[PDB]
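Consider the following assembly input.
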Amino acid sequence: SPLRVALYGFGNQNKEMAKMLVERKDVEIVAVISNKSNVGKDFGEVIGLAPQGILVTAGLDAAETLRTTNPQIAMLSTLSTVGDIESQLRACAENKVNVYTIAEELTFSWTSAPEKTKEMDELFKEHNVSLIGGGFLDGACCDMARTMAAMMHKIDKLDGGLQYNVDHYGQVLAIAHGVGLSYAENGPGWTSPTSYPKSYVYNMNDWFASAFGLTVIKTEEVKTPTKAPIELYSEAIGRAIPVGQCTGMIVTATTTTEEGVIIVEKQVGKCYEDGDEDMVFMNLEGNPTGGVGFTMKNPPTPAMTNTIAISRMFQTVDAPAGYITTDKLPTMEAYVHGRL
Amino acid sequence: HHHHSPLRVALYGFGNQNKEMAKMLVERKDVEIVAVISNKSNVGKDFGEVIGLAPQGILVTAGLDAAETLRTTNPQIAMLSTLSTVGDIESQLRACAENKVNVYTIAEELTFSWTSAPEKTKEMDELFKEHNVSLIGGGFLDGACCDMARTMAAMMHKIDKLDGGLQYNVDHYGQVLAIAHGVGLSEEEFYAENGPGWTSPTSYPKSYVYNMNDWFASAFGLTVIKTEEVKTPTKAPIELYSEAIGRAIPVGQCTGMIVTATTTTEEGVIIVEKQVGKCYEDGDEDMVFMNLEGNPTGGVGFTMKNPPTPAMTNTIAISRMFQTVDAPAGYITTDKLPTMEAYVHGRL
Ligand SMILES: NC(=O)c1ccc[n+]([C@@H]2O[C@H](COP(=O)([O-])OP(=O)(O)OC[C@H]3O[C@@H](n4cnc5c(N)ncnc54)[C@H](OP(=O)(O)O)[C@@H]3O)[C@@H](O)[C@H]2O)c1
Ligand SMILES: NC(=O)c1ccc[n+]([C@@H]2O[C@H](COP(=O)([O-])OP(=O)(O)OC[C@H]3O[C@@H](n4cnc5c(N)ncnc54)[C@H](OP(=O)(O)O)[C@@H]3O)[C@@H](O)[C@H]2O)c1
């Protein structure tokens, strides 16, 4: 019988994920949960398809829907933090439903959220199911670099990066980045060892430290404004940015290690001049010397987030019970013809 | 984790690649070098002294005596870094197989030799099967090209086209390899009968990209209709100097060669790979690129700029040692292996 799959959340990501999972003949969508949006309608009609024979169910009824529909996995595409997804995780664990989530933090949440991660580990262990996640950060950043790093004899430094256009993420995300502003205490740009939530690059640094078998001393984030040598216009905050005014934000996560290996990753959200593009880069310094690195220009991150998730489904079902970080998994399941 | 005896490793060949591979394997505490074979070069000297190191207690042995050396030294694997073709390495493969020694080779063709050399590959498969050992290879083409793309391709829902590429400086590969890529030829000389540009259904050996195409077709579970190669000379808008042929290359004279391998498939998937070997002008760099077209639609690709390919060839090989020993007997293409063994601190 095909894998029984729930879509937990049905916004931008799981709408697109649904189109692909409908085509997959090794999968059967058994449930699609939203909060309030589209809640009476057939999920296929929502996304421009023929009726599928399954209705979008409500957030409040999640636990009952997961009990009666008997999914082996829920694709949790709701929120970013172990705290904010806790309620959805609990509904899954209590009904013996495995989870792959695209929640950024769950790339590696052990140090950013120690107690909430421990709780979710123990809960999934108790009901004998697995929690895994990270989406784009899991597959396109960490797993790509894990393959590349096999070709290193000695790593002294991992120097990695993620660049996105923050003007295309709405207000709220623009406000959380220094767009419009100019290091004050109540401005993001102030940071401390206790500040929460941590950046995506914080969780990626800990993923690498785990994969490379390193011992973390400290991961510190340093938040720095971006500027342009010319006047920009922001269509996010609706104002010109004069020269020397903040256009966006870099979070640089620096991990020091008892082995002397340095891990530096930059998260860059800014408005973009001529020539700026969305980017992933990973570079390894050591031996081989002079830099072993890859770049991805203009990655279709939204679609790739969903396919990474799809590549982890059977692995998540088959993983040991508990919170399993992706460094403990094999590579994303290989592309093969004949699944559609 | 209980102690395992160190892997017993032979270096079969001892030129540019295995000299550098030796320096790294000496540092690896999970490995014991048990033999280093050359043809004639350095035969009789201690392999450590050859490569600027303290005496290791192992002398460089001769090509003709390979079978005896592999019999008395009892290696579990031979790192075969000699020649490029399943035909030309046959005699070294036979020495290994008959002494139950597994092989990882950097022989370009053994990325995927099944269609470029059907009968010789079948023979080597059956020989390794009979002696219950594994033949695996491809070096830089295996790990940095095919395996990197295999990870990236997991992120595809549907692949319509793979568009891939490899660029290297042939002026740094000696006179013979420069001549094989047509450096210093006029275009007309380039396209003369059995010149570098000449191409036919009977042409042999095939390009590296030919074998990579078939690796992808195997990995993606596709059925090959035809792979054709098309050869094109490279030119430069200014005069270059070639160290390899030791003279100026006038404007419009061939600076090297592009081999484009195009594979069609019963599934409608197209696989196109370019091999570019030429003399560089200012701003030319060594490159790998792989791009996947389909769904996701917006272009799923990576580029590697300025890879240290010689050292990466060796580390790829090192990442395959335990896998090769562990693999089922026979000729095992790397699409049937897991990813290159992950980097982990504390092996040195
Ligand atoms: N890993 C990556 O690189 C990556 C990339 C893309 C997205 N993400 C993250 O993934 C998350 C989802 O993104 P998206 O674009 O799909 O978001 P979205 O469009 O905001 O969709 C959220 C969906 O989840 C539902 N939801 C929220 N809270 C819920 C709850 N308690 N119970 C049930 N359903 C609930 C929403 O219902 P309503 O419509 O009724 O609110 C909606 O259906 C975000 O946190 C985003 O940052 C990660
Ligand atoms: N897959 C990849 O990415 C990749 C990359 C680089 C190289 N390669 C290939 O690897 C091969 C070797 O490369 P290289 O740069 O190390 O070459 P090299 O400097 O020519 O060394 C080759 C070694 O093999 C020895 N040898 C040759 N035939 C032998 C035989 N029958 N028995 C024993 N030893 C033998 C040679 O001995 P003598 O010095 O005494 O003649 C030499 O020690 C070539 O085919 C090259 O094209 C592949």
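Chain B touches chain A through 52 residues (CB under 8 Å). Ask yourself how this observation constrains the way the partners meet.
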